[PDB]
Amino acid sequence: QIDGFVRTLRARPEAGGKVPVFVFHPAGGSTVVYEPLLGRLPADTPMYGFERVEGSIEERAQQYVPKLIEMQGDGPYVLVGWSLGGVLAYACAIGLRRLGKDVRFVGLIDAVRAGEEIPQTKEEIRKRWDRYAAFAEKTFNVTIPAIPYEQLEELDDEGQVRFVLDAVSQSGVQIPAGIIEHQRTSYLDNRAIDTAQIQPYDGHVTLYMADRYHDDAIMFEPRYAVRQPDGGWGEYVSDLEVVPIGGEHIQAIDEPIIAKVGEHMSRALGQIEADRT
Numbered sequence: 382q383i384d385g386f387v388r389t390l391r392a393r394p395e396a397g398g399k400v401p402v403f404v405f406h407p408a409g410g411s412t413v414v415y416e417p418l419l420g421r422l423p424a425d426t427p428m429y430g431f432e433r434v435e436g437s438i439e440e441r442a443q444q445y446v447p448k449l450i451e452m453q454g455d456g457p458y459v460l461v462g463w464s465l466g467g468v469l470a471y472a473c474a475i476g477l478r479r480l481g482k483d484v485r486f487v488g489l490i491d492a493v494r495a496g497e498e499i500p501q502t503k504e505e506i507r508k509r510w511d512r513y514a515a516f517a518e519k520t521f522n523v524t525i526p527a528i529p530y531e532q533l534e535e536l537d538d539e540g541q542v543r544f545v546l547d548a549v550s551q552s553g554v555q556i557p558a559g560i561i562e563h564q565r566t567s568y569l570d571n572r573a574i575d576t577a578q579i580q581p582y583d584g585h586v587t588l589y590m591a592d593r594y595h596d597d598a599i600m601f602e603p604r605y606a607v608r609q610p611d612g613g614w615g616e617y618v619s620d621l622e623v624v625p626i627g628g629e630h631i632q633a634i635d636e637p638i639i640a641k642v643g644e645h646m647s648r649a650l651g652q653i654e655a656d657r658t
Protein backbone atom coordinates (compact mmCIF):
# COMPACT_ATOMS: atom_id res chain seq x y z
CA GLN A 382 0.00 0.00 0.00
CA ILE A 383 2.61 2.59 1.16
CA ASP A 384 6.37 2.05 0.70
CA GLY A 385 8.44 4.98 1.97
CA PHE A 386 6.94 7.96 0.14
CA VAL A 387 5.45 5.84 -2.64
CA ARG A 388 1.78 5.01 -2.62
CA THR A 389 0.40 2.32 -4.91
CA LEU A 390 -2.97 3.45 -6.28
CA ARG A 391 -2.97 0.68 -8.85
CA ALA A 392 -0.14 -1.84 -8.88
CA ARG A 393 1.31 -2.90 -12.23
CA PRO A 394 1.32 -6.62 -13.24
CA GLU A 395 4.49 -8.71 -12.65
CA ALA A 396 5.26 -8.45 -16.39
CA GLY A 397 4.07 -6.39 -19.35
CA GLY A 398 1.09 -4.16 -18.58
CA LYS A 399 0.44 -0.57 -19.54
CA VAL A 400 2.79 2.38 -18.96
CA PRO A 401 2.46 3.56 -15.31
CA VAL A 402 1.20 7.02 -14.36
CA PHE A 403 3.25 8.81 -11.67
CA VAL A 404 1.33 11.45 -9.67
CA PHE A 405 2.79 13.88 -7.13
CA HIS A 406 1.07 15.10 -3.97
CA PRO A 407 -0.22 18.73 -3.70
CA ALA A 408 0.33 20.97 -0.68
CA GLY A 409 -1.60 19.65 2.33
CA GLY A 410 -2.82 16.56 0.48
CA SER A 411 -1.97 12.96 -0.06
CA THR A 412 -2.02 11.35 -3.49
CA VAL A 413 -5.48 9.93 -2.79
CA VAL A 414 -6.65 13.17 -4.42
CA TYR A 415 -5.88 11.32 -7.70
CA GLU A 416 -8.44 8.53 -7.31
CA PRO A 417 -11.19 10.30 -9.36
CA LEU A 418 -8.64 10.72 -12.19
CA LEU A 419 -7.58 7.09 -11.99
CA GLY A 420 -11.25 6.18 -12.54
CA ARG A 421 -11.18 8.25 -15.78
CA LEU A 422 -8.08 6.57 -17.24
CA PRO A 423 -8.08 3.23 -19.17
CA ALA A 424 -8.77 0.03 -17.28
CA ASP A 425 -5.57 -1.42 -15.78
CA THR A 426 -3.53 1.78 -15.99
CA PRO A 427 -1.03 1.47 -13.08
CA MET A 428 -0.67 4.52 -10.85
CA TYR A 429 1.90 5.36 -8.13
CA GLY A 430 2.02 8.48 -5.98
CA PHE A 431 4.92 10.45 -4.53
CA GLU A 432 4.23 11.68 -1.02
CA ARG A 433 5.87 14.65 0.71
CA VAL A 434 9.64 14.93 1.27
CA GLU A 435 11.65 17.93 2.46
CA GLY A 436 13.84 20.50 0.70
CA SER A 437 13.84 22.88 -2.24
CA ILE A 438 11.77 21.75 -5.21
CA GLU A 439 15.07 20.59 -6.73
CA GLU A 440 16.03 18.64 -3.60
CA ARG A 441 12.65 16.95 -3.52
CA ALA A 442 12.94 15.97 -7.19
CA GLN A 443 16.41 14.64 -6.42
CA GLN A 444 14.86 12.19 -3.90
CA TYR A 445 12.05 11.13 -6.20
CA VAL A 446 14.22 10.42 -9.24
CA PRO A 447 16.18 7.39 -7.86
CA LYS A 448 12.79 5.82 -7.11
CA LEU A 449 11.17 6.60 -10.47
CA ILE A 450 14.14 4.88 -12.11
CA GLU A 451 13.86 1.86 -9.80
CA MET A 452 10.24 1.44 -10.79
CA GLN A 453 10.36 2.30 -14.53
CA GLY A 454 13.99 2.16 -15.73
CA ASP A 455 14.60 3.93 -19.05
CA GLY A 456 10.97 4.94 -19.54
CA PRO A 457 8.54 5.77 -20.87
CA TYR A 458 7.72 8.19 -18.04
CA VAL A 459 4.27 9.73 -17.64
CA LEU A 460 4.32 12.37 -14.92
CA VAL A 461 1.23 14.13 -13.60
CA GLY A 462 0.52 16.55 -10.82
CA TRP A 463 -2.20 18.91 -9.60
CA SER A 464 -1.11 22.23 -8.10
CA LEU A 465 2.27 21.79 -6.34
CA GLY A 466 2.12 18.21 -7.58
CA GLY A 467 2.48 19.68 -11.04
CA VAL A 468 5.60 21.67 -10.13
CA LEU A 469 7.17 18.51 -8.65
CA ALA A 470 6.26 16.43 -11.69
CA TYR A 471 7.94 18.96 -13.96
CA ALA A 472 11.05 19.18 -11.77
CA CYS A 473 11.27 15.40 -12.11
CA ALA A 474 10.91 15.55 -15.88
CA ILE A 475 13.80 18.02 -16.11
CA GLY A 476 15.97 15.67 -14.06
CA LEU A 477 14.99 12.49 -15.88
CA ARG A 478 15.69 13.88 -19.34
CA ARG A 479 19.08 15.19 -18.18
CA LEU A 480 19.93 11.65 -17.06
CA GLY A 481 19.06 10.43 -20.56
CA LYS A 482 15.61 8.95 -19.80
CA ASP A 483 12.44 9.01 -21.91
CA VAL A 484 9.65 11.29 -20.67
CA ARG A 485 6.67 11.05 -23.02
CA PHE A 486 4.07 13.02 -21.04
CA VAL A 487 3.96 15.78 -18.43
CA GLY A 488 0.44 16.70 -17.29
CA LEU A 489 0.13 19.85 -15.20
CA ILE A 490 -3.38 19.98 -13.74
CA ASP A 491 -4.01 23.70 -13.24
CA ALA A 492 -0.45 24.33 -12.03
CA VAL A 493 -0.70 28.06 -12.65
CA ARG A 494 1.79 30.70 -11.56
CA ALA A 495 0.66 33.84 -9.70
CA GLY A 496 -0.07 36.53 -12.32
CA GLU A 497 2.62 38.89 -10.92
CA GLU A 498 5.96 38.53 -9.12
CA ILE A 499 6.09 38.33 -5.31
CA PRO A 500 8.42 41.03 -3.81
CA GLN A 501 11.07 39.87 -1.24
CA THR A 502 10.61 42.65 1.31
CA LYS A 503 9.79 42.79 5.03
CA GLU A 504 6.46 44.47 4.09
CA GLU A 505 5.46 41.48 1.95
CA ILE A 506 6.27 39.12 4.83
CA ARG A 507 4.01 41.13 7.14
CA LYS A 508 1.19 41.18 4.59
CA ARG A 509 1.50 37.44 3.91
CA TRP A 510 1.19 36.59 7.62
CA ASP A 511 -1.79 38.93 7.79
CA ARG A 512 -3.43 37.04 4.91
CA TYR A 513 -2.56 33.68 6.49
CA ALA A 514 -4.21 34.76 9.77
CA ALA A 515 -7.39 35.78 7.92
CA PHE A 516 -7.38 32.43 6.11
CA ALA A 517 -6.83 30.54 9.40
CA GLU A 518 -9.58 32.46 11.19
CA LYS A 519 -12.06 31.64 8.42
CA THR A 520 -10.87 28.03 7.96
CA PHE A 521 -10.82 27.02 11.65
CA ASN A 522 -13.25 29.50 13.13
CA VAL A 523 -10.72 30.68 15.76
CA THR A 524 -9.05 34.00 16.66
CA ILE A 525 -5.42 34.44 15.68
CA PRO A 526 -3.58 37.07 17.78
CA ALA A 527 -1.79 39.98 16.13
CA ILE A 528 1.84 39.02 15.60
CA PRO A 529 4.80 41.34 16.53
CA TYR A 530 6.36 41.31 13.09
CA GLU A 531 9.73 42.63 14.24
CA GLN A 532 11.71 39.54 15.32
CA LEU A 533 9.95 37.54 12.60
CA GLU A 534 10.84 39.66 9.60
CA GLU A 535 14.48 38.70 10.21
CA LEU A 536 14.01 34.93 10.56
CA ASP A 537 13.97 32.35 7.79
CA ASP A 538 10.67 30.63 6.87
CA GLU A 539 10.89 27.76 9.39
CA GLY A 540 11.78 30.31 12.09
CA GLN A 541 8.76 32.35 11.04
CA VAL A 542 6.32 29.46 11.35
CA ARG A 543 7.82 28.37 14.67
CA PHE A 544 7.21 31.89 16.05
CA VAL A 545 3.63 32.18 14.74
CA LEU A 546 2.97 28.79 16.35
CA ASP A 547 4.30 29.90 19.76
CA ALA A 548 2.15 33.04 19.41
CA VAL A 549 -1.06 31.15 18.58
CA SER A 550 -0.42 28.79 21.50
CA GLN A 551 0.43 31.50 24.05
CA SER A 552 -2.91 33.19 23.17
CA GLY A 553 -4.63 30.00 24.39
CA VAL A 554 -5.53 28.12 21.22
CA GLN A 555 -4.19 24.56 21.58
CA ILE A 556 -3.90 23.20 18.01
CA PRO A 557 -4.06 19.43 17.35
CA ALA A 558 -0.62 18.14 16.36
CA GLY A 559 -1.98 16.87 13.03
CA ILE A 560 -3.14 20.41 12.16
CA ILE A 561 0.11 22.11 13.26
CA GLU A 562 2.01 19.65 11.09
CA HIS A 563 -0.30 20.04 8.10
CA GLN A 564 -0.27 23.87 8.14
CA ARG A 565 3.50 24.14 8.74
CA THR A 566 4.31 21.74 5.90
CA SER A 567 1.82 23.36 3.51
CA TYR A 568 3.22 26.81 4.26
CA LEU A 569 6.76 25.58 3.70
CA ASP A 570 5.68 23.92 0.40
CA ASN A 571 4.28 27.27 -0.72
CA ARG A 572 7.65 28.90 0.06
CA ALA A 573 9.55 26.14 -1.75
CA ILE A 574 7.46 26.83 -4.87
CA ASP A 575 7.89 30.58 -4.64
CA THR A 576 11.69 30.54 -4.27
CA ALA A 577 12.21 27.90 -6.98
CA GLN A 578 13.23 28.99 -10.46
CA ILE A 579 11.34 27.12 -13.19
CA GLN A 580 13.79 25.58 -15.68
CA PRO A 581 13.24 25.43 -19.48
CA TYR A 582 12.03 22.09 -20.79
CA ASP A 583 12.10 20.98 -24.42
CA GLY A 584 9.69 18.05 -23.97
CA HIS A 585 5.91 17.99 -24.47
CA VAL A 586 3.91 19.48 -21.61
CA THR A 587 0.15 19.52 -21.33
CA LEU A 588 -1.39 22.18 -19.11
CA TYR A 589 -5.03 21.60 -18.13
CA MET A 590 -6.22 25.10 -17.36
CA ALA A 591 -9.11 26.04 -15.06
CA ASP A 592 -10.80 29.50 -15.24
CA ARG A 593 -9.70 30.81 -11.87
CA TYR A 594 -8.12 30.21 -8.49
CA HIS A 595 -10.64 29.43 -5.74
CA ASP A 596 -11.44 31.94 -2.95
CA ASP A 597 -9.02 30.65 -0.28
CA ALA A 598 -6.06 30.86 -2.66
CA ILE A 599 -6.96 34.45 -3.63
CA MET A 600 -7.48 35.33 0.03
CA PHE A 601 -4.04 33.92 0.86
CA GLU A 602 -2.24 35.43 -2.13
CA PRO A 603 -4.12 38.18 -4.14
CA ARG A 604 -1.83 37.72 -7.20
CA TYR A 605 -3.54 34.41 -7.81
CA ALA A 606 -6.48 36.55 -8.88
CA VAL A 607 -4.72 37.16 -12.24
CA ARG A 608 -3.63 34.40 -14.66
CA GLN A 609 -1.60 34.47 -17.87
CA PRO A 610 -3.28 32.42 -20.70
CA ASP A 611 -0.31 29.99 -20.60
CA GLY A 612 -0.17 29.74 -16.79
CA GLY A 613 3.33 31.28 -16.78
CA TRP A 614 4.80 28.25 -18.56
CA GLY A 615 5.07 29.41 -22.20
CA GLU A 616 8.31 31.20 -21.29
CA TYR A 617 9.90 27.84 -20.43
CA VAL A 618 8.16 25.24 -22.59
CA SER A 619 8.29 25.55 -26.38
CA ASP A 620 5.91 22.58 -26.96
CA LEU A 621 3.09 23.52 -24.57
CA GLU A 622 -0.44 22.18 -25.10
CA VAL A 623 -3.09 24.15 -23.21
CA VAL A 624 -6.33 22.30 -22.57
CA PRO A 625 -9.23 24.38 -21.09
CA ILE A 626 -11.24 22.56 -18.38
CA GLY A 627 -13.15 25.46 -16.74
CA GLY A 628 -14.07 25.77 -13.07
CA GLU A 629 -11.80 26.63 -10.16
CA HIS A 630 -8.40 25.28 -9.20
CA ILE A 631 -9.88 23.29 -6.30
CA GLN A 632 -12.56 21.58 -8.42
CA ALA A 633 -10.05 20.39 -11.01
CA ILE A 634 -9.63 16.99 -9.28
CA ASP A 635 -13.35 16.50 -8.63
CA GLU A 636 -16.14 15.33 -10.90
CA PRO A 637 -17.29 16.48 -13.35
CA ILE A 638 -14.24 18.48 -14.45
CA ILE A 639 -11.75 15.64 -13.97
CA ALA A 640 -13.66 13.86 -16.76
CA LYS A 641 -12.17 16.36 -19.26
CA VAL A 642 -8.66 15.88 -17.92
CA GLY A 643 -9.18 12.10 -17.93
CA GLU A 644 -10.63 11.96 -21.46
CA HIS A 645 -7.77 14.01 -22.92
CA MET A 646 -5.16 12.17 -20.89
CA SER A 647 -6.52 8.77 -21.99
CA ARG A 648 -5.93 9.57 -25.65
CA ALA A 649 -2.34 10.60 -24.81
CA LEU A 650 -1.82 7.24 -23.04
CA GLY A 651 -3.41 5.47 -26.01
CA GLN A 652 -0.83 6.96 -28.37
CA ILE A 653 1.98 5.90 -26.02
CA GLU A 654 0.66 2.32 -25.89
CA ALA A 655 0.33 2.16 -29.69
CA ASP A 656 4.08 2.94 -30.01
CA ARG A 657 5.63 0.65 -27.40
CA THR A 658 4.82 -2.03 -30.02
Ligand SMILES: CCC(C)(C)c1ccc(S(=O)(=O)N[C@@H](Cc2ccccc2)[C@@H](O)Cc2nc(N(C)C)no2)cc1
Pocket residue numbers: 407408409410411414520559560563567597
Ligand atom coordinates in the same frame (compact mmCIF):
# COMPACT_ATOMS: atom_id res chain seq x y z
C1 LIG B 1 -8.75 17.92 0.91
C2 LIG B 1 -7.33 17.88 0.26
C3 LIG B 1 -6.87 19.04 -0.66
C4 LIG B 1 -5.49 18.77 -1.24
C5 LIG B 1 -7.92 19.11 -1.78
C6 LIG B 1 -6.81 20.29 0.23
C7 LIG B 1 -5.91 20.26 1.29
C8 LIG B 1 -5.88 21.30 2.18
C9 LIG B 1 -6.72 22.41 1.96
S1 LIG B 1 -6.64 23.82 3.14
O1 LIG B 1 -5.43 23.68 4.01
O2 LIG B 1 -6.47 25.08 2.31
N1 LIG B 1 -8.03 23.68 4.14
C10 LIG B 1 -8.05 22.52 5.04
C11 LIG B 1 -7.88 22.90 6.51
C12 LIG B 1 -7.55 21.72 7.42
C13 LIG B 1 -6.23 21.27 7.51
C14 LIG B 1 -5.91 20.20 8.36
C15 LIG B 1 -6.91 19.58 9.09
C16 LIG B 1 -8.23 19.99 8.98
C17 LIG B 1 -8.56 21.08 8.14
C18 LIG B 1 -9.35 21.76 4.89
O3 LIG B 1 -10.43 22.64 5.05
C19 LIG B 1 -9.35 21.03 3.54
C20 LIG B 1 -10.54 20.10 3.63
N2 LIG B 1 -11.52 20.01 2.75
C21 LIG B 1 -12.41 19.11 3.27
N3 LIG B 1 -13.66 18.72 2.64
C22 LIG B 1 -14.48 17.71 3.24
C23 LIG B 1 -14.09 19.45 1.45
N4 LIG B 1 -11.96 18.68 4.45
O4 LIG B 1 -10.80 19.31 4.67
C24 LIG B 1 -7.61 22.45 0.87
C25 LIG B 1 -7.67 21.39 0.01
Ligand SMILES: CCC(C)(C)c1ccc(S(=O)(=O)N[C@@H](Cc2ccccc2)[C@@H](O)Cc2nc(N(C)C)no2)cc1
Pocket residue numbers: 407408409464465467468491492493494495516564567568569570571572574597598601612613630
Ligand atom coordinates in the same frame (compact mmCIF):
# COMPACT_ATOMS: atom_id res chain seq x y z
C1 LIG C 1 -0.19 27.61 3.64
C2 LIG C 1 -1.67 27.94 3.75
C3 LIG C 1 -2.54 27.58 2.53
C4 LIG C 1 -3.49 26.42 2.87
C5 LIG C 1 -3.41 28.81 2.25
C6 LIG C 1 -1.81 27.23 1.23
C7 LIG C 1 -1.17 28.29 0.60
C8 LIG C 1 -0.52 28.07 -0.59
C9 LIG C 1 -0.54 26.77 -1.15
S1 LIG C 1 0.34 26.49 -2.73
O1 LIG C 1 1.70 27.07 -2.83
O2 LIG C 1 0.49 25.03 -2.87
N1 LIG C 1 -0.56 27.30 -4.00
C10 LIG C 1 -1.39 26.64 -5.00
C11 LIG C 1 -2.73 27.30 -5.06
C12 LIG C 1 -3.45 27.00 -3.78
C13 LIG C 1 -3.71 28.01 -2.86
C14 LIG C 1 -4.37 27.71 -1.67
C15 LIG C 1 -4.74 26.39 -1.38
C16 LIG C 1 -4.44 25.36 -2.27
C17 LIG C 1 -3.79 25.66 -3.49
C18 LIG C 1 -0.77 26.74 -6.35
O3 LIG C 1 -0.51 28.07 -6.74
C19 LIG C 1 0.59 26.00 -6.27
C20 LIG C 1 1.17 26.14 -7.67
N2 LIG C 1 2.19 26.92 -8.02
C21 LIG C 1 2.37 26.81 -9.37
N3 LIG C 1 3.41 27.44 -10.16
C22 LIG C 1 3.47 27.31 -11.59
C23 LIG C 1 4.51 28.21 -9.55
N4 LIG C 1 1.41 25.97 -9.81
O4 LIG C 1 0.63 25.56 -8.75
C24 LIG C 1 -1.23 25.70 -0.52
C25 LIG C 1 -1.88 25.94 0.66
